[PDB]
Design a protein around this ligand. Structure first.
Ligand SMILES: Nc1nc2cc[nH]c2c(=O)[nH]1
Ligand SMILES: Nc1nc2cc[nH]c2c(=O)[nH]1
Ligand SMILES: [Zn+2]
Ligand SMILES: [Zn+2]
Ligand SMILES: [Zn+2]
Ligand SMILES: [Zn+2]
Lengths: 381, 390, 381, 390
RNA sequence: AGCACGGCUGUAAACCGUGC
RNA sequence: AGCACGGCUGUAAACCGUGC
């Protein structure tokens, strides 16, 4: 993998990652996002419906929470998860947790972190974690890590320290296990920057992780309620400073368009696309402008009666399947009558709109019109 | 004016192949018609249906009449525009709801009064209202509101409903304001009584409605009776007009009823069975929620052309069905509609090629292991129109 | 137990319940609330701190969620929970669920409902439930019931029906088990009205329950997000119509002052006092006027810097320990520095303010000045 | 002007009973002083402390200096007004923080530089600043900022800190602007070196500060050394002035050090042990989180008068400690402060009644099962001042 | 909830029974 | 998370180790 920067406007890194995914090359753009999935399918969408979307990201995020239960099955399939889930054309990043639900936390111990599934708590030792990675064969995978800091609010400085030390211990063990296996060689490991709200431990985490031969870094624990971020936003830029620039920066739990822009300012490259999913799930549609649990400002609520007779598309000019082929009035009916097509059509548009947003970020960055974009984004509905 | 053009006829049986010439394009028959009730195919986009090569699907007046309301759909360029369906739409009157919503149903000669437990607000469905709604929706084929009684019930009830239907039919024929664009169809509500059904057959055929449907047969009626009442109905229905059997979508049922002269069918079964995690195969069905299909890396049906069977394994679906992802349901809905269409298209071909009897034997060997293990009812039904199975 | 009504203004029932609690009489007023507790102690408060509060309710709510784990212990104590928890002077109502956390839902079956504890799911069959009640010996207890309707949103009309039928089956079984035991005779059983959003099943639930010799009724499943209520508010009045008036009406998950007033309008008598607790937990204080997860309008947030130097009491004229002895500036410090005294002082005032609110409701009802109260309540901060 | 009025003196030992005359009321000695650092007793209201009959408790300059800030507390009518404490307040300089925050501590002659990992913002603590903060707070007894080195460390470090303390003391005496209202106390930072401690004793006693404290002894130093350095210190300290030993609050430690001539003590141990689910008894402690106390229906201590032991059982507390209710912690905090006070008040009584040696034997029989199983260190310490245990 | 059975015929049905 | 051990001396401590 090689990251090349087209430009660096303000603190914002515009570029491409060229030799990605083992098989030849797959050019992936920064800054960018990752197709959010549940059990390896995009939520609500089959291949048909997925490929009906313009600007689907090259890489797709999947999570151990859903896949680990079926370690056995995947071990028997012997051909890796991409082919199993019928996404063979896609690059795959395996995260430890689903960002929409990071509530359970692993009950991390020195010898075990645990994801949460339908079955229940799945206790993964390092060996088991690396075993699962063998079965899955993703392009990228987050290394087993201790991210519980954010979950609790106590943040005992001794706890914060353990989060860093544990994460580094896991990283070093996993690196060795990768050395031994040929298959695993082909996978790229992602280091997890940690340290919570303690500046010192954040910098310590950043440097020590960077010392390892990881392919990229995950910025954990900045995931927070909307108000909290501005605070941790300073800590963010402190940390990215300590990371080498020739390696990509992932962040977890940040998908809100506003927060996204800001993290790009602080030199973050890759984002989860779970925000469009959450919007979909509450019967809402992304309407905010980019072209140049509370319902947010970026969206309208199609459950509302104002839309029962509104025969405009969701967003005028949106080339997605739904806006082009259907009206708000129609979606309103679908939601009201509790039909599964509501979700499919909402997911399709919400994804396409979000994917369009990123396209205009990169475009803005080329013309240093990003500040104007910030303002256009904060336009209401 | 005849809306169906006949093409071929298995000499041995009553099996017919033909075409329906409707305002929104030709429809090959025999035809299975997927049922999307509230202007939706329950999880699939109109494009996905368009791709499966479906040329006619249903909507339901009762549901659509209440929500979203006839006025709204009219402002929406009709049911066609609303759901963005290019092809033909057929609309049930709201008759069936009598059986399913028997609890909420009060019957007078004036119409059917429907209440919903959630909302006090009530609805009368007079033939006139049913027609009014259907005229607004603009469905190519509309259906008469009939007094539908369940097959299980016996009493003067059967007789009363049968005659009421006739009067309701005339009121519907009266109510129609759009014959040019929409084709009203009568429904033979005779119950399981030969005489009543027969009497209903006689009087109803006397009206000049474009097609005829066979109703009252969707229940758990004995199978021996089921097929006989079909046979009775078809034997007396105009050959130069469609025979639409309503509430039937099981494979063995569909094969046999084509052989008994039926031309059109609708059923919610394929779409529902899909939302319940069952996938239809030549050999019956696959309960994919079951743990057996965990390491099964083959498709649902190697011979299926539907998108699900091209790109997905039984194993992955089995894992996805246990997920919170609704995608699992859609993959099955897609395939199940495909199976039914592949079956109906397969059947029509065999009628045209004068090997419908051969087709049926091949079918029965798939479904039942042998024509040997075929259920007696189907054996009786087939033999009555001159098809034995070795 | 006998309920006598002083008056009935609009739909609002003002009165007293005289012969309460087996031992002699304990006059309890309607409309009124119940001391919210966690594991039999009021949250944060010891006896000292509790009795430091003016207008503590006569009855206190406890929950099986916390107590059931210790069935064994209480069985051995042989003297009932009031004495065990050092609240012997108090009347005790045992609810099945804690209102603050009703998320898990029981996984109800025909033969078993399950509360959720520290240990995990506790599977109570009817016999076990009634066994636990023997150990506890409360004044009142909610009968084992199926309230899952509200948890899910599907509300299959066949599910809604099962909720009613199951609840009635549990009621009849428990009634018999009470017949057999002398100790249990002394306890009063509360029937649970159910039926979700289906009007028909609601009325059915109301009538059939009323047919039983229950001492009172619990109005379940009206517990909802703030917007939802106005909708279910009609269904509420429908139901109370079907209940005899000489028996008190409890409701679960309704503690917001606004929602409280409205439920009183629809002839509800008794409320949980968990709202003041939730306010406490987010570092906020009740400030709304009555005298004549989002932070609500009824409260201020003492974490805010505007209060760092504000040397006024929480609410001027409030006779509670905190307002009388401490300032906002002080609480602000306590919260900022993460000290346990913040919680104690907040809980004390939040309780006292809430308890004062009820006093003014009853007072308003006597003078039919309730409508004016409604408006004074909706005053901001 | 002498702030302590002596009352009685066990002839055999150095045990003293007396009274401190402070601006906010008289304080009986020997006294244990609960430590609430950030203007709070960590879960209990000032009323609850008032009720336990506490007449003096501590605040800490470092924490309170940073948050909420000296200016704020001044506007708040001083530390007294802020926390609504009627009675006497003693304030640690911020010396101890050097040991506990050794990691964040940089030492120059000018002062102590303190950083917090969370916030870049730093603080210098010069004697002058420590005094300024203390003067604003208005604590009845304020403490000199001293160069505190841990007992475990050895080097010129011990010596350097010892002399620095002396210079810091003079700067503090200089810095005091409020002798009329507040009584500065010196702290003997000699380490475990006899000569250094001795030298520190000499020079510091030469200043006319109202009281003297013994510092540097709060560590895990060998017990044999602990008591000897106490004995050395008290043996050379003015008898007509208080002897305040800092960082000591364990029972056997407290009994013995009174016998070695100590008059005042502070420790966070009782309040912390409580927040950790341990409850202090004559026979050591009760780990109430442990499952043994599940069916124990007796109080913590039948002989305790504190509210916890009047109305609550061990069993209920054991169940409440496993709850999310913070109440469990408060019940223990209340009791633990009570135990320490009951102990100190019990000890003073026995000195007055000339049976302190008898009291000590009764105590040791409780704590250790017998004066027989007493730890040698306490045996040595007691025998050095003429108390044997049968 | 989750798991296992049994049920689905122009949809009170991403469901309904029965266990655990 | 929770459970079990071991730890707490003028409070980076409703905590910290170690398992599961
Ligand atoms: N209208 C109507 N619909 C159906 C669907 C199945 N059977 C019937 C019937 O008898 N009448
Ligand atoms: N200032 C100060 N405080 C303490 C508390 C324990 N030991 C000491 C000490 O040596 N100095
Ligand atoms: Zn769109
Ligand atoms: Zn298929
Ligand atoms: Zn107050
Ligand atoms: Zn006590």
């Amino acid at each position: 993998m090689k990251l090349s920067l087209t430009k660096v406007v303000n603190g914002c890194r515009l570029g491409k990652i060229k030799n990605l995914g083992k098989t030849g090359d797959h050019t992936m753009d920064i800054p960018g996002c990752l197709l959010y999935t549940k059990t390896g399918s995009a939520p609500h969408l089959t291949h048909h419906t997925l490929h009906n979307i313009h600007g689907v990201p090259a890489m797709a995020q999947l999570t151990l929470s859903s896949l680990a239960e079926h370690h056995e099955v995947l071990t028997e399939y012997k051909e890796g998860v991409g082919k199993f889930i019928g996404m063979p054309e896609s690059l795959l990043y395996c995260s430890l947790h689903d960002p929409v639900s990071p509530c359970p936390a692993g009950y991390v111990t020195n010898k075990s972190v645990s994801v949460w599934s339908v079955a229940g708590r799945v206790e993964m030792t390092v060996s088991k974690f690396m075993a699962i990675q063998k079965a899955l064969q993703p392009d990228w995978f987050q290394c087993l890590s201790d991210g519980e800091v954010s979950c609790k609010e106590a943040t005992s400085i001794k706890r914060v320290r353990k989060s860093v030390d544990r994460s580094l211990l896991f990283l070093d063990n996993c690196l060795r296990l990768q050395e031994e296996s040929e298959v695993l060689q082909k996978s790229v490991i992602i280091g997890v920057i940690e340290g919570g709200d303690v500046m010192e431990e954040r910098l310590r985490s950043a440097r020590e992780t960077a010392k390892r031969p990881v392919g990229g870094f995950l910025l954990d624990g900045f995931q927070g309620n909307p108000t909290t971020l501005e605070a941790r936003l300073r800590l963010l830029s402190s940390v990215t400073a300590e990371l080498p620039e020739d390696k990509p920066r992932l962040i977890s739990g940040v998908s809100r368009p506003d927060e996204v822009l800001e993290c790009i300012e602080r030199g973050v490259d890759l984002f989860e696309s779970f925000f469009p999913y959450q919007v979909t799930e509450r019967g809402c549609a992304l309407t905010f402008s980019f072209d140049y649990q509370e319902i947010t400002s970026f969206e309208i609520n199609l459950k509302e009666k104002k839309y029962q007779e509104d025969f405009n598309p969701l967003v005028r000019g949106c080339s997605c399947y739904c806006c082009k082929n259907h009206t708000r009035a129609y979606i309103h009916h679908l939601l009201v009558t509790n039909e599964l097509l509501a979700g499919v059509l909402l997911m399709m548009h919400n994804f396409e709109h979000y994917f369009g947003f990123f396209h205009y970020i990169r475009e803005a960055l080329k013309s240093d019109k990003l500040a104007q974009l910030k303002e256009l984004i904060h336009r209401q509905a | 004016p005849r809306i169906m053009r006949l093409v071929a006829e298995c000499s041995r049986s009553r099996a017919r192949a033909g075409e329906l010439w409707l305002p929104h394009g030709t429809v090959a028959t025999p035809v299975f018609m997927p049922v999307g009730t509230q202007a939706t195919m329950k999880g699939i986009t109109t494009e996905q249906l368009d791709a499966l090569g479906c040329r006619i699907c249903l909507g339901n007046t009762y549901h659509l009449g209440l929500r979203p309301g006839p006025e709204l759909i009219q402002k929406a360029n009709g049911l066609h525009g609303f759901m963005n369906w290019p092809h033909n739409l057929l609309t049930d009157s709201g008759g069936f709801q009598m059986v399913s919503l028997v609890s909420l149903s009060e019957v007078t000669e004036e119409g059917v009064r429907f209440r919903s437990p959630y909302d006090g607000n009530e609805t009368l469905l007079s033939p006139e209202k049913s027609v009014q709604i259907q005229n607004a929706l603009g469905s190519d084929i509309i259906m008469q509101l009939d007094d539908v009684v369940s097959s299980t019930v016996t009493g003067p009830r059967v007789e009363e409903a049968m005659y009421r239907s006739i009067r309701w039919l005339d009121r519907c024929i009266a109510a129609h304001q759009r014959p040019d664009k929409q084709n009203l169809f009568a429904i033979i509500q005779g119950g399981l009584d030969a005489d009543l059904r027969a009497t209903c057959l006689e009087e109803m055929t006397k009206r000049d409605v474009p097609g005829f449907a066979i109703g009252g047969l969707s229940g758990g009626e004995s199978k021996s009776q089921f097929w006989r009442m079909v046979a009775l109905s078809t034997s007396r229905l105009p050959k130069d007009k469609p025979r639409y059997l309503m509430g039937v979508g099981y494979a063995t049922d569909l094969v046999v009823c084509v052989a008994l002269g039926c031309d059109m069918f609708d059923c919610v079964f394929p779409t529902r069975t899909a939302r319940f995690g069952s996938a239809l195969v030549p050999t019956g069905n696959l309960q994919l929620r079951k743990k057996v299909f965990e390491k099964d890396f083959g498709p649902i049906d190697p011979e299926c052309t539907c998108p699900t069977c091209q790109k997905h394994s039984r194993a992955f679906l089995h894992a996805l069905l246990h997920s919170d992802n609704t995608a699992a349901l859609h993959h099955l809905t897609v395939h199940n509609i495909a199976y039914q269409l592949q079956l109906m298209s397969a059947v029509r071909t065999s009628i045209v090629e004068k090997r419908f009897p051969d087709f049926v034997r091949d079918f029965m060997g798939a479904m039942y292991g042998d024509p040997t293990l075929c259920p007696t009812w189907a054996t009786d039904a087939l033999a009555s129109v001159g098809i034995t199975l070795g």
